[PDB]
Amino acid sequence: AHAFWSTQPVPQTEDETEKIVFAGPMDEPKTVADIPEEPYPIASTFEWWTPNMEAADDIHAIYELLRDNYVEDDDSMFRFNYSEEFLQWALCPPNYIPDWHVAVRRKADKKLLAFIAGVPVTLRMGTPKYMKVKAQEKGEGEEAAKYDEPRHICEINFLCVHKQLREKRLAPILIKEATRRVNRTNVWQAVYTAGVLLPTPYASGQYFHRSLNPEKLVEIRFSGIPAQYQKFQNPMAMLKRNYQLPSAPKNSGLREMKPSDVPQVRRILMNYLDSFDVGPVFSDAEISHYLLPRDGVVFTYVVENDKKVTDFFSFYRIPSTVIGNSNYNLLNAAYVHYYAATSIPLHQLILDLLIVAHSRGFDVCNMVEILDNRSFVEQLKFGAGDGHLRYYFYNWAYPKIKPSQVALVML
């Protein structure tokens, strides 16, 4: 059933994941010296290429591949259109390893045929709370705690094969080469997410959407008009009213994040994230990189009253190409990123996210039910979509956890 995934150090069935009680590696210990020094073999008509993610033109080439060939819905209505600026942000965080970004090109014209990207993340991925308790009850605390220390691992994203090369077993080759490059740097685990079900997620969450421009969302068939709106003389007018938001933020002291806020934002974020079983650890440089405002890419606001930062939220932009509509060709989506609330309820913090995103011309706000995202779904009028995000580890046995015990946002 899985000619590639059956050969890999991942849990092979749901049952297996159901049985795991302690975090830890799946494969035997290996050294960098054990890993092939030469690139994985590839057909003579292709070549491995390491793009330079800082160089505008190489980012452009990757941008074009993804624009035309990255994830689309099953009805081929929307395809992600991550921007060049977003891709430089996502793929070159502090201390990134250039060699972890892997492409295939056709040797003749050098047309870009495939890509996958790894970036460093420092992740807490030891045994979850519910399982450390079972371990205490059984006299097995030492085993349960062995891997408690945050680990420096690889986060994988942006796997893409050109549509003309689909179903040719190229993705397994790209994954093997990426694994080799990561292993040659003495890293042995990865974390990744996908919409599709593969062997085997340690957590799964539904996507939620909050309409900001319902007229446009209905026009492009992102949204339908719920049946009960047909009871109205003007179904669309009622839908627009339903989703109306204030034109200015409500929280006293909300303002954009600035560099001097990095230590305070790191503090309150780290205190909050600590409470979840799986979550990242960020340095000041990583807080700066992932949270300071960048035009068109990431938007971050703090609540400062009386000279202290007590709360913050962030969102990022991923537009999608709208493929077959007469009136629009772009969907402008805002995605809930990290946040932390200490002075106000989370719903009150995130309402100002929606207000700001709507003011800035976003059409929808998206999120997965990770973190405490479920705590403001109903009041703030999010609805569940039909999609899910599944969370996976490579070479890491991990108990099944609920998505509200995951604190890692994946771009």
* Residue 167 backbone zone (phi > 0: left; psi -120 to 50: alpha; other: beta): left
CB of 222 vs ligand HXE, minimal distance in Å: 5
**Smallest separation (angstroms) from ligand HXE to the CB of 95:** 21
In angstroms, give the least distance from the CB of 105 to ligand MYA: 16
Give, in order, the Cα–Cα distances in Å from 276 to each of 109, 125, 297, 318, 408. 48, 10, 26, 26, 9
Among the candidate windows 164-172, 225-233, 303-311, 377-385, which touches Mg ion by CB under 5 A? 164-172
Spatial neighbors of 315 by CB under 8 A, at least 6 apart, are 298, 299, 334, 335, 336, 337, 353, 356, 357, 365
Answer with the entry of ligand MYA, Mg ion, ligand HXE, none that 313 interacts with (C-beta below 5 to 8 A by kind).
none
Nearer to Mg ion, 156 or 161 (CB): 161
Residue with smaller CB distance to ligand HXE, 278 or 389: 389
Angle at alpha carbon of residue 392, lines to 316 and 289, rounded to 5° = 30
Q: For residues 368 and 392, what is the distance between their CA atoms, to the nearest angstrom?
A: 15
Chain centre distance of CA 382? 19
Residues 195-234 as x/- pattern, contact with ligand MYA by CB under 6 A: -x-x------------------------------------
Q: Pick out the residues of the known binding site for tetradecanoyl-CoA.
A: 2-5, 159, 161, 166-167, 169-171
CB neighbour class for 280 (10 Å; exposed up to 12, middle 13-18, buried from 19): buried
Q: What are phi and psi of 294, to 5 degrees?
A: -135, 125
Nearest to 236 by CA among 256, 255, 211: 211
Q: Which is nearer to ligand MYA, 2 or 360 (CB)?
A: 2
Residue from 42, 61, 71, 236 touching ligand HXE (CB under 6 A): that is: 71
Distance separating alpha carbons of residues 185 and 289, to the nearest angstrom: 23
Binding of ligand HXE at residue 297 (CB under 6 A)?
no
Q: What distances in angstroms separate CA 156 from CA 38, 55, 338, 349, one per listed residue?
A: 21, 21, 19, 30
Binding of ligand HXE by 80 (CB under 6 A): yes
Q: Applying CB under 6 A, which residues contact ligand HXE?
A: 71-73, 78-80, 157, 193-195, 207, 222, 318, 320, 331, 333, 364, 366, 385-387, 389, 410
Which residues have a catalytic role annotated?
411
Q: Applying CB under 6 A, which residues contact ligand MYA?
A: 2-5, 69-71, 154, 156-161, 166-172, 175, 178-179, 182-183, 187-190, 192, 194, 196, 198, 394-395
Q: Applying CB under 5 A, which residues contact Mg ion?
A: 161, 168, 170
